[PDB]
Design a protein around this ligand. Structure first.
Ligand SMILES: OCc1ccccc1OC1CCOCC1
Length: 209
Protein backbone atom coordinates (compact mmCIF):
# COMPACT_ATOMS: atom_id res chain seq x y z
CA UNK A 1 0.00 0.00 0.00
CA UNK A 2 1.64 3.18 -1.30
CA UNK A 3 0.67 6.70 -0.21
CA UNK A 4 1.53 9.58 -2.56
CA UNK A 5 2.01 13.05 -1.09
CA UNK A 6 2.53 16.47 -2.64
CA UNK A 7 5.55 18.44 -1.48
CA UNK A 8 4.80 21.79 0.09
CA UNK A 9 5.18 24.47 -2.57
CA UNK A 10 8.29 25.93 -0.94
CA UNK A 11 10.01 22.54 -0.77
CA UNK A 12 9.16 21.83 -4.41
CA UNK A 13 10.70 25.21 -5.28
CA UNK A 14 13.84 24.32 -3.31
CA UNK A 15 14.13 21.00 -5.14
CA UNK A 16 13.75 22.52 -8.61
CA UNK A 17 16.34 25.19 -7.80
CA UNK A 18 18.80 22.49 -6.72
CA UNK A 19 18.06 20.51 -9.89
CA UNK A 20 18.07 23.39 -12.39
CA UNK A 21 20.70 25.88 -11.16
CA UNK A 22 24.08 25.62 -12.87
CA UNK A 23 26.41 24.87 -9.97
CA UNK A 24 29.54 22.77 -10.41
CA UNK A 25 30.46 22.10 -6.75
CA UNK A 26 28.11 19.13 -6.47
CA UNK A 27 30.35 17.07 -4.17
CA UNK A 28 29.02 18.90 -1.09
CA UNK A 29 25.98 16.59 -1.11
CA UNK A 30 28.01 13.96 0.74
CA UNK A 31 29.09 16.35 3.50
CA UNK A 32 25.43 17.29 3.99
CA UNK A 33 24.16 13.71 4.23
CA UNK A 34 27.00 12.63 6.54
CA UNK A 35 26.33 15.64 8.77
CA UNK A 36 22.65 14.67 8.93
CA UNK A 37 23.71 11.13 9.88
CA UNK A 38 26.00 12.54 12.58
CA UNK A 39 23.14 14.61 14.01
CA UNK A 40 20.89 11.54 14.02
CA UNK A 41 23.60 9.54 15.81
CA UNK A 42 24.00 12.37 18.34
CA UNK A 43 20.27 12.17 19.08
CA UNK A 44 20.18 8.45 19.88
CA UNK A 45 23.39 8.70 21.91
CA UNK A 46 21.95 11.49 24.05
CA UNK A 47 18.77 9.48 24.64
CA UNK A 48 20.82 6.42 25.62
CA UNK A 49 22.57 8.46 28.33
CA UNK A 50 19.51 8.21 30.60
CA UNK A 51 17.91 5.08 29.08
CA UNK A 52 20.39 2.42 27.90
CA UNK A 53 17.49 0.33 26.55
CA UNK A 54 17.22 2.82 23.67
CA UNK A 55 20.19 0.92 22.19
CA UNK A 56 18.48 -2.48 22.37
CA UNK A 57 17.84 -2.00 18.63
CA UNK A 58 21.60 -1.67 18.03
CA UNK A 59 24.59 -0.70 20.15
CA UNK A 60 26.89 0.35 17.29
CA UNK A 61 26.85 4.02 16.22
CA UNK A 62 28.42 4.33 12.77
CA UNK A 63 28.14 5.57 9.19
CA UNK A 64 28.60 3.35 6.13
CA UNK A 65 29.06 4.46 2.52
CA UNK A 66 28.08 1.69 0.11
CA UNK A 67 28.63 2.31 -3.61
CA UNK A 68 27.14 -0.08 -6.16
CA UNK A 69 28.13 0.39 -9.80
CA UNK A 70 25.68 -2.22 -11.11
CA UNK A 71 22.66 -0.50 -9.55
CA UNK A 72 24.33 2.93 -9.96
CA UNK A 73 23.47 3.76 -6.35
CA UNK A 74 25.36 5.39 -3.50
CA UNK A 75 23.94 4.48 -0.09
CA UNK A 76 24.61 6.38 3.15
CA UNK A 77 23.69 4.18 6.12
CA UNK A 78 23.65 5.35 9.73
CA UNK A 79 22.48 3.74 12.97
CA UNK A 80 21.11 6.99 14.37
CA UNK A 81 17.76 7.68 15.99
CA UNK A 82 15.82 7.19 12.75
CA UNK A 83 12.53 8.77 11.75
CA UNK A 84 8.89 7.97 12.42
CA UNK A 85 6.32 7.96 9.63
CA UNK A 86 5.15 11.41 10.74
CA UNK A 87 8.78 12.58 10.67
CA UNK A 88 9.24 11.26 7.12
CA UNK A 89 6.06 12.97 5.88
CA UNK A 90 6.98 16.19 7.73
CA UNK A 91 9.98 16.84 5.46
CA UNK A 92 12.20 14.08 6.91
CA UNK A 93 12.56 15.55 10.38
CA UNK A 94 13.48 19.07 9.24
CA UNK A 95 11.84 22.48 9.46
CA UNK A 96 12.14 22.66 5.68
CA UNK A 97 9.54 25.38 5.09
CA UNK A 98 11.25 28.08 7.17
CA UNK A 99 14.69 26.74 6.26
CA UNK A 100 13.99 27.05 2.54
CA UNK A 101 12.71 30.60 3.03
CA UNK A 102 15.94 31.66 4.74
CA UNK A 103 18.08 29.73 2.23
CA UNK A 104 16.49 31.44 -0.78
CA UNK A 105 16.88 34.91 0.73
CA UNK A 106 20.56 34.13 1.27
CA UNK A 107 21.02 32.97 -2.33
CA UNK A 108 19.66 36.25 -3.71
CA UNK A 109 21.90 38.04 -1.16
CA UNK A 110 25.20 36.46 -2.26
CA UNK A 111 25.15 32.95 -0.78
CA UNK A 112 25.67 29.81 -2.86
CA UNK A 113 24.26 26.29 -2.76
CA UNK A 114 27.15 24.88 -0.69
CA UNK A 115 25.74 26.83 2.28
CA UNK A 116 22.49 24.80 2.25
CA UNK A 117 23.37 22.95 5.46
CA UNK A 118 23.33 26.17 7.49
CA UNK A 119 19.56 26.39 6.86
CA UNK A 120 18.66 22.84 7.92
CA UNK A 121 17.63 21.55 4.48
CA UNK A 122 20.90 19.89 3.49
CA UNK A 123 19.17 16.59 2.70
CA UNK A 124 17.77 18.04 -0.52
CA UNK A 125 21.29 18.60 -1.88
CA UNK A 126 21.08 14.88 -2.69
CA UNK A 127 19.28 15.95 -5.88
CA UNK A 128 22.49 17.56 -7.11
CA UNK A 129 23.66 14.07 -8.12
CA UNK A 130 20.60 11.82 -7.81
CA UNK A 131 17.61 11.54 -10.15
CA UNK A 132 15.78 9.64 -7.39
CA UNK A 133 16.29 9.29 -3.64
CA UNK A 134 15.00 6.46 -1.45
CA UNK A 135 15.05 6.86 2.34
CA UNK A 136 14.63 3.72 4.45
CA UNK A 137 14.30 4.46 8.15
CA UNK A 138 13.48 2.73 11.44
CA UNK A 139 12.73 4.60 14.67
CA UNK A 140 12.36 2.84 18.02
CA UNK A 141 8.76 4.11 18.29
CA UNK A 142 7.59 3.08 14.80
CA UNK A 143 7.92 0.50 12.03
CA UNK A 144 10.29 0.52 9.06
CA UNK A 145 9.12 2.87 6.29
CA UNK A 146 10.36 3.70 2.80
CA UNK A 147 10.29 7.28 1.49
CA UNK A 148 10.91 7.90 -2.21
CA UNK A 149 10.88 10.83 -4.62
CA UNK A 150 12.12 11.60 -8.13
CA UNK A 151 11.27 15.28 -7.46
CA UNK A 152 8.43 16.42 -9.75
CA UNK A 153 6.47 17.76 -6.78
CA UNK A 154 5.53 14.48 -5.07
CA UNK A 155 6.91 11.74 -2.85
CA UNK A 156 5.64 8.34 -1.74
CA UNK A 157 5.67 6.59 1.64
CA UNK A 158 5.14 2.86 2.14
CA UNK A 159 5.85 0.21 4.73
CA UNK A 160 9.26 -1.26 3.93
CA UNK A 161 9.21 -5.02 3.41
CA UNK A 162 12.95 -5.09 2.69
CA UNK A 163 15.87 -6.01 4.93
CA UNK A 164 15.18 -5.03 8.57
CA UNK A 165 17.50 -2.31 9.88
CA UNK A 166 17.03 -2.46 13.65
CA UNK A 167 17.43 1.30 13.99
CA UNK A 168 18.73 4.11 11.81
CA UNK A 169 18.31 5.58 8.35
CA UNK A 170 19.44 4.57 4.86
CA UNK A 171 19.66 7.16 2.07
CA UNK A 172 19.85 5.48 -1.35
CA UNK A 173 20.99 7.86 -4.10
CA UNK A 174 20.06 6.66 -7.59
CA UNK A 175 22.73 8.70 -9.34
CA UNK A 176 22.37 10.67 -12.55
CA UNK A 177 24.00 9.15 -15.62
CA UNK A 178 26.81 11.74 -15.63
CA UNK A 179 27.49 11.61 -11.86
CA UNK A 180 28.94 8.10 -11.51
CA UNK A 181 32.26 9.53 -10.28
CA UNK A 182 30.76 9.42 -6.77
CA UNK A 183 30.79 5.61 -7.03
CA UNK A 184 34.59 5.54 -7.36
CA UNK A 185 36.55 4.75 -4.20
CA UNK A 186 39.24 7.42 -4.55
CA UNK A 187 36.69 10.16 -5.26
CA UNK A 188 34.61 9.27 -2.19
CA UNK A 189 37.71 9.11 0.02
CA UNK A 190 38.80 12.53 -1.25
CA UNK A 191 35.42 14.06 -0.42
CA UNK A 192 35.19 12.49 3.04
CA UNK A 193 38.70 13.64 3.95
CA UNK A 194 38.01 17.14 2.59
CA UNK A 195 34.62 17.86 4.19
CA UNK A 196 33.98 15.25 6.93
CA UNK A 197 37.31 14.86 8.73
CA UNK A 198 35.86 15.89 12.12
CA UNK A 199 32.78 13.65 12.21
CA UNK A 200 32.77 11.88 15.56
CA UNK A 201 31.66 8.50 14.23
CA UNK A 202 33.44 5.82 12.18
CA UNK A 203 32.80 6.31 8.47
CA UNK A 204 33.36 3.04 6.60
CA UNK A 205 33.63 3.16 2.81
CA UNK A 206 32.61 -0.23 1.43
CA UNK A 207 34.50 -1.63 -1.55
CA UNK A 208 33.08 -3.68 -4.41
CA UNK A 209 34.09 -6.92 -6.13
O1 LIG B 1 19.78 9.85 9.15
C1 LIG B 1 19.89 11.24 8.86
C2 LIG B 1 18.85 11.70 7.87
C3 LIG B 1 18.54 10.94 6.74
C4 LIG B 1 17.57 11.35 5.84
C5 LIG B 1 16.90 12.54 6.05
C6 LIG B 1 17.18 13.31 7.16
C7 LIG B 1 18.14 12.89 8.07
O2 LIG B 1 18.42 13.68 9.17
C8 LIG B 1 17.33 14.21 9.99
C9 LIG B 1 17.91 15.21 10.97
C10 LIG B 1 18.76 14.44 11.96
O3 LIG B 1 17.97 13.52 12.71
C11 LIG B 1 16.65 13.33 12.20
C12 LIG B 1 16.69 13.04 10.72
Amino acid sequence: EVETFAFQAEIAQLMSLIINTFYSNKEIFLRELISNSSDALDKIRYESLTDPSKLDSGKELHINLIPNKQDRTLTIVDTGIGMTKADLINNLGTIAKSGTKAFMEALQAGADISMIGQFGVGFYSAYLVAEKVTVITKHNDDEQYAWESSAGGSFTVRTDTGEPMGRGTKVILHLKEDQTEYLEERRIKEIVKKHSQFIGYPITLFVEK
